[PDB]
Design a protein around this ligand. Structure first.
Ligand SMILES: C[C@H](NC(=O)CC(=O)Nc1ccc(C(=N)N)cc1)c1ccc(Oc2cccc(C(=O)O)c2)c(Br)c1
Ligand SMILES: *[C@H]1O[C@H](CO)[C@@H](O)[C@H](O)[C@H]1O
Ligand SMILES: *[C@@H]1O[C@@H](C)[C@@H](O)[C@@H](O)[C@@H]1O
Ligand SMILES: [Ca+2]
Ligand SMILES: [Ca+2]
Ligand SMILES: [Ca+2]
Ligand SMILES: [Ca+2]
Ligand SMILES: [Cl-]
Ligand SMILES: [Cl-]
Ligand SMILES: [Mg+2]
Lengths: 254, 141, 197
């Protein structure tokens, strides 16, 4: 996160830290005791599928405390439509092998219904983005969880206000822009998979996933996020599915 | 009535009580600027004569137009919009705290996410579990 | 669908209506309005009108800067839309036509009173006047003259009243304007109807 603040311990209780072979991989969002939502692109280079861990209650990566809970990732479900190395359909649904225990430091973020997210949450101006990613474009990552408030844009505005970049990726109906084009504040590579959480009448909801952008806090550019409202029915059906022998599942979309 | 034309020039008798032409008013004011000052409003007419303000609203004439002052339950240029007929889910979530469902032929209903239940007011949601989704316990949920 | 165009703000004494083109064919509109950092509020839901009264939203804070947008929806994911110009009611609303409430001769002087100009801004059950809203920013100007004058005289006030010197045995005529001197454009209202002694 560039230009954000340290999220005070326990104030981002749905943030997930994903590890592979014990090394930081990506962020994620807990949505109930068993299921985590992250970005599909986080898994493009995975070879050791049995070495994926989700850590909940994490705050300071340099110190362990009794609020951290680790769980093995049993399943990684990605839309069959997603193409490794590209931006569209950047979402992954992860099944934990055993549920986490809900505490003052570990709480899920609400996955909203589609129509409520489209007609109400989409028009709440600001939402929070968080993670242990880079504090500056191509710089070092963060030791303490960072958080930033970003305003959302309709795609027509995002295209009209962004500096043209030759052959840049299309911003599809499965994405949305949020952030600032003045080079001051944005999410960054290391925050991928993390939540874009929206506060509405006393409850927080999952509206986006940190996905991509042109650099990080680059003048003339906004952060691009996976548009979670497009996947509600897909996620709900998959959360009711039976576990399979292998970890990776490329599930049909829609 | 030619006998009324014997009376001297009067803004009240010629323009106020009866309708006067620009020339008749110009003979009273004499100066071109003073006659324009009078003419711009008097010739403009009263757009409030058609009683455009509905639902108990009040009309105030303006130059080639009017403004309607509405009672609190109404809005619109002519107070035609009934605020009480706008309880739909695209209007501030239909007043629901969490989910809103439109029901054509009847009123909308409010619903809650899993881990919450609807209160007796028909709009508010309360937790049914110790750690409901989307609440931050250290900030006293 | 086709996007709305020629979005124009029509505002007098804070009664504020957004207007646009074209007249809809197999499409309906919804308007949204926000301040630069606030949430978007929807109004005029699925209307076939080419106008939307936004008075109730702008009167929440007349000094804020509002942006509106008109969404086009087909009769049968994000819709086509067009943004309006920015609108700051306090700086841009037209000042309404004033009315001379009364005039009285007090000997060799005349007091001229301007009626309180009603606005669409409410303060619990009552409509605020233009002076309630603008305060020191609002002045009234008076044009006055006798039948045989070589033009007209001007007086200005920080209240709604003028006290002018008059010649004995001369009948005077009056006209008033609401003025926001600090403005550069849309500084004055239209003139009140003329009243004579
Ligand atoms: C989805 C995937 N993401 C990543 O790798 C991590 C990443 O970019 N993280 C990040 C998070 C936030 C910000 C931020 N908010 N500034 C920046 C970076 C990604 C994949 C391909 C990309 O480019 C192409 C190239 C060719 C074809 C196409 C094609 O889609 O056709 C797209 C991009 Br660009 C991003
Ligand atoms: C009065 O009549 C109609 C409403 O019935 C309105 O359109 C006019 O502008 C007004 O003078
Ligand atoms: C004009 O104002 C409206 C709001 C109502 O109070 C009417 O009764 C009045 O004449
Ligand atoms: Ca730690
Ligand atoms: Ca008379
Ligand atoms: Ca003549
Ligand atoms: Ca008129
Ligand atoms: Cl486990
Ligand atoms: Cl006033
Ligand atoms: Mg005559």
């Amino acid at each position: 996160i560039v230009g954000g603040k340290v999220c005070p311990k326990g104030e981002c209780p749905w943030q997930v830290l994903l590890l592979v072979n014990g090394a930081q991989l990506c962020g994620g969002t807990l949505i109930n005791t068993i299921w985590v939502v992250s970005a599909a692109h986080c898994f493009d280079k995975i070879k050791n599928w049995r070495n994926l861990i989700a850590v909940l209650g994490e705050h300071d990566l340099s110190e362990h405390d009794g609020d951290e809970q680790s769980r093995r990732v049993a399943q990684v479900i990605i839309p069959s439509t997603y193409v490794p190395g590209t931006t569209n359909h950047d979402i992954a649904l992860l099944r934990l092998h055993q549920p986490v225990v809900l505490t003052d430091h570990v709480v899920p973020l609400c996955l909203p219904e589609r129509t409520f997210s489209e007609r109400t949450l989409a028009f709440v101006r600001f939402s929070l983005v968080s993670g242990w990613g880079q504090l500056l474009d191509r710089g070092a990552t963060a030791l303490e969880l960072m958080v930033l408030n970003v305003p959302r844009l309709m795609t027509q505005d995002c295209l009209q206000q962004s500096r043209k970049v030759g052959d840049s990726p299309n911003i599809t109906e499965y994405m949305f822009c949020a952030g600032y084009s003045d080079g001051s504040k944005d999410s960054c590579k290391g925050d991928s998979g993390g939540p874009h959480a929206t506060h509405y009448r006393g409850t927080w909801y999952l509206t986006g996933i940190v996905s991509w952008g042109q650099g990080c806090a680059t003048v003339g550019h906004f952060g691009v996020y996976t548009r979670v409202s497009q996947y509600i029915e897909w996620l709900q059906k998959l959360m009711r599915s039976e576990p399979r022998p292998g970890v990776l599942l490329r599930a049909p979309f829609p | 009535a030619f006998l009324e034309e014997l009376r001297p020039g009067s803004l009240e008798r010629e323009c106020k009580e009866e309708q006067c032409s620009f020339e008749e008013a110009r003979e009273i004011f004499k100066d071109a600027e003073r006659t324009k000052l009078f003419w711009i409003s008097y010739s403009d007419g009263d757009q409030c004569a058609s009683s455009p303000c509905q639902n108990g609203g009040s009309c105030k004439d303006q130059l080639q137009s009017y403004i309607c002052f509405c009672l609190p339950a109404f809005e619109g240029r002519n107070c035609e919009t009934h605020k009480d007929d706008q309880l739909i889910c695209v209007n501030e979530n239909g007043g629901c705290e969490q989910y809103c469902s439109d029901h054509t032929g009847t009123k909308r209903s409010c619903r809650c996410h899993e881990g919450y239940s609807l209160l007796a007011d028909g709009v508010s949601c309360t937790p049914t579990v110790e750690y409901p989704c989307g609440k931050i316990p250290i900030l006293e949920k | 669908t086709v996007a709305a165009y020629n979005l124009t703000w029509k505002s007098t004494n804070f009664k504020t209506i957004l207007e646009w083109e074209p007249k809809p064919v197999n499409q309906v509109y919804t308007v949204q309005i926000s301040t630069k950092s606030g949430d978007w509020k929807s109004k005029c839901f699925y209307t076939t009108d080419t106008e939307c009264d936004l008075t109730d939203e702008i009167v929440k804070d007349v000094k804020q800067t509002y942006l509106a947008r008109v969404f086009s929806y087909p009769a049968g994911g994000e819709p086509l839309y067009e943004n309006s110009p920015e609108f700051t009611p306090y700086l841009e609303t037209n000042l309404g036509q004033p009315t001379i409430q009364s005039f009285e001769q007090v000997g060799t002087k005349v007091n001229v009173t301007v009626e309180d100009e009603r606005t669409l801004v409410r303060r619990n059950n009552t409509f605020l006047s233009l002076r309630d809203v603008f305060g020191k920013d609002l002045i009234y100007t008076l044009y006055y003259w006798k039948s045989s004058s070589s033009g007209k005289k001007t007086a200005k006030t920080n209240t709604n009243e003028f006290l002018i010197d008059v010649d004995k045995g001369e009948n005077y005529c009056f006209s008033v304007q609401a003025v926001i001197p600090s403005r550069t454009v849309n500084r004055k209202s239209t003139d009140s109807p003329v009243e004579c002694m």
